Amino acid sequence: LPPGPLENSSAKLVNDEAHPWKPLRPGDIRGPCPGLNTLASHGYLPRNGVATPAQIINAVQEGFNFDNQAAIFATYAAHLVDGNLITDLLSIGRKTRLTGPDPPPPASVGGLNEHGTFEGDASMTRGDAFFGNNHDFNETLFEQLVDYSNRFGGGKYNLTVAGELRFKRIQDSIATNPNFSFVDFRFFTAYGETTFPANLFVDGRRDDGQLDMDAARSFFQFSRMPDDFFRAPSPRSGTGVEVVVQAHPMQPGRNVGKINSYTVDPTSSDFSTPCLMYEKFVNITVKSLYPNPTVQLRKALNTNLDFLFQGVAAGCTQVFPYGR
Numbered sequence: 001l002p003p004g005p006l007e008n009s010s011a012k013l014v015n016d017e018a019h020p021w022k023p024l025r026p027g028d029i030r031g032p033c034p035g036l037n038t039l040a041s042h043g044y045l046p047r048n049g050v051a052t053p054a055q056i057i058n059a060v061q062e063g064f065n066f067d068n069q070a071a072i073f074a075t076y077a078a079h080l081v082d083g084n085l086i087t088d089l090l091s092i093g094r095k096t097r098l099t100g101p102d103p104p105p106p107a108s109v110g111g112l113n114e115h116g117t118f119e120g121d122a123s124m125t126r127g128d129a130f131f132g133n134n135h136d137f138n139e140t141l142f143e144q145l146v147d148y149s150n151r152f153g154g155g156k157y158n159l160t161v162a163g164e165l166r167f168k169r170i171q172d173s174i175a176t177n178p179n180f181s182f183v184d185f186r187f188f189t190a191y192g193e194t195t196f197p198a199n200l201f202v203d204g205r206r207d208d209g210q211l212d213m214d215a216a217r218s219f220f221q222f223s224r225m226p227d228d229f230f231r232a233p234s235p236r237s238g239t240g241v242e243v244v245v246q247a248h249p250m251q252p253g254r255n256v257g258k259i260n261s262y263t264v265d266p267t268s269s270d271f272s273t274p275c276l277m278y279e280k281f282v283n284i285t286v287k288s289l290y291p292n293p294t295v296q297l298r299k300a301l302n303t304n305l306d307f308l309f310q311g312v313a314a315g316c317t318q319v320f321p322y323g324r
């Protein structure tokens, strides 16, 4: 019941008659992900910003040609930590009554806005949770993306710009955020996310990895596809992530309660240990939210954990927080 890959994955107009941009209505939810935000604001996703895992996987495939394996891993990771496992509903932003009754602690069901579950620090266009707003578009951070595009990309965002801006944001957070955390799941997502604008926001007829700043603003700020936008011509997600990782090689770590105190975490996964990243996500992060689930919640957890495993890096063994 995770959707499979697109039967037809060719480039096509996705800013079409059936999927017009509309402004936000009172109550509509938007969050820290410009990709899901754009799909909601073009009605690929429900325009209110509440969705099921299957709607999200269909929408990122249909609207952007996100690859099926990456869609499955990201969607079921997010739903396991931020979504209501009983109703099968996830907010793409703030915590809402609309996803169902607030679960017994320590589960949070906080939507994609929930800090430290999926969302984390050193986002390109969003502030760190520590500073009080982890989801709204930040013009100072966007201006920095434009500046790094001018410096390293001839005015366009590309994998070279991604490498420099990723490092600058890490350095920004080490210097200013006493609770800065850059380990395990966020260490992985923080690098992959910087490739998405080059791989997925670039018009599919061109697919040259060079994103112009008008398109960049339209997606990041307004959740809006360019006029006549064509999706990528094949499924992809994090192509070129190794280029960004190696631009300024980092060890995973955290500040220890003061600025400029970045301490390497030797227990953290990194890009050499993708199976450990999956193992710690399920056996520490998911387990911490659902330490002794009821019979009903245990069944929903195991179903969604089976789905998550379908998205894992080839070669990893399934991990069972609740046995089999």
Ligand SMILES: *[C@@H]1O[C@H](CO)[C@@H](O[C@@H]2O[C@H](CO)[C@@H](O[C@@H]3O[C@H](CO[C@H]4O[C@H](CO[C@H]5O[C@H](CO)[C@@H](O)[C@H](O)[C@@H]5O)[C@@H](O)[C@H](O[C@H]5O[C@H](CO)[C@@H](O)[C@H](O)[C@@H]5O)[C@@H]4O)[C@@H](O)[C@H](O[C@H]4O[C@H](CO[C@H]5O[C@H](CO)[C@@H](O)[C@H](O)[C@@H]5O)[C@@H](O)[C@H](O)[C@@H]4O[C@H]4O[C@H](CO)[C@@H](O)[C@H](O)[C@@H]4O)[C@@H]3O)[C@H](O)[C@H]2NC(C)=O)[C@H](O)[C@H]1NC(C)=O
Pocket: 279, 283, 287, 319, 320, 321, 322, 323, 324
């Ligand atoms: C992802 O996460 C999941 C967790 O979410 C991981 O899955 C878990 O993995 C752990 C580790 O394998 C499992 O823990 C093991 O559980 C078994 C079974 O426990 C149950 O059965 C025993 C025995 O019951 C029988 O006998 C009694 C009488 O004695 C009867 O009354 C019964 O009816 C049975 O016939 C019970 O004693 C257990 O009760 C305890 O636990 C329950 C529930 O918590 C309590 O309510 C009880 O009151 C009681 O406290 C239970 O019912 C168990 O036998 C294993 O114990 C052995 O290993 C532990 C840990 O040993 C290591 O760690 C310590 C440091 O903590 C260190 O000192 C040691 O040297 C080892 O490094 C020992 O403490 C025990 O003494 C015992 O040791 C013996 O056997 C081991 C070999 O395994 C050997 O090392 C020793 O030398 C010694 O001979 C153990 O606790 C979980 O069950 C499992 N959970 C699930 C859901 O599957 C998953 O691994 C992870 N994945 C990854 C990839 O990381």
Ligand code: HEM
Pocket: 032, 033, 034, 035, 036, 056, 060, 064, 066, 070, 071, 072, 074, 075, 078, 112, 118, 119, 120, 121, 122, 123, 124, 125, 126, 189, 193, 194, 196, 197, 200, 201
């Ligand atoms: C598959 C389902 C997806 C989920 C669950 C998801 C979830 C998230 C979340 C929670 C964040 C916030 C992380 C952070 O920066 O703190 C994020 C960031 C991001 N996502 Fe998504 N996402 C998905 C798919 C996509 C797609 C398809 C795109 C591109 C079309 C995309 C582009 C981005 C970008 C660019 C960021 C970084 C924003 C920034 O740092 O300024 N995502 N995603």
Ligand SMILES: *[C@@H]1O[C@H](CO)[C@@H](O[C@@H]2O[C@H](CO)[C@@H](O[C@@H]3O[C@H](CO)[C@@H](O)[C@H](O)[C@@H]3O)[C@H](O)[C@H]2NC(C)=O)[C@H](O)[C@H]1NC(C)=O
Pocket: 127, 131, 138, 139, 140, 141
């Ligand atoms: C958007 O993101 C930007 C960039 O990360 C945030 O900018 C930071 O905002 C804080 C204040 O809220 C500034 O802190 C101040 O620094 C001065 C001078 O060093 C000091 O006198 C004050 O005590 C205060 O701490 C900080 O300088 C600033 N950083 C940058 C690069 O501009 C911003 O808050 C985010 N949100 C919004 C709504 O823009």
Ligand SMILES: *[C@@H]1O[C@H](CO)[C@@H](O[C@@H]2O[C@H](CO)[C@@H](O)[C@H](O)[C@H]2NC(C)=O)[C@H](O)[C@H]1NC(C)=O
Pocket: 152, 153, 154, 158, 159, 160, 161, 209
């Ligand atoms: C990011 O943009 C910069 C600037 O366009 C690229 O560096 C240029 O690459 C072209 C190759 O087609 C060369 O003709 C120039 O010599 C380079 N100019 C500068 C200023 O370095 C870089 O290749 C781009 N990165 C990616 C991954 O596409």
Ligand SMILES: *[C@@H]1O[C@H](CO)[C@@H](O)[C@H](O)[C@H]1NC(C)=O
Pocket: 008, 009, 010, 011, 012, 013
């Ligand atoms: C796949 O999609 C494109 C739409 O851009 C279309 O031209 C092509 O015919 C489609 N293939 C099939 C078998 O329908």
Ligand SMILES: [Cl-]
Pocket: 005, 006, 066, 067, 068, 069, 235
């Ligand atoms: Cl695919």
Ligand SMILES: [Mg+2]
Pocket: 032, 119, 120, 121, 122, 123, 126, 127, 128, 134
């Ligand atoms: Mg963030």
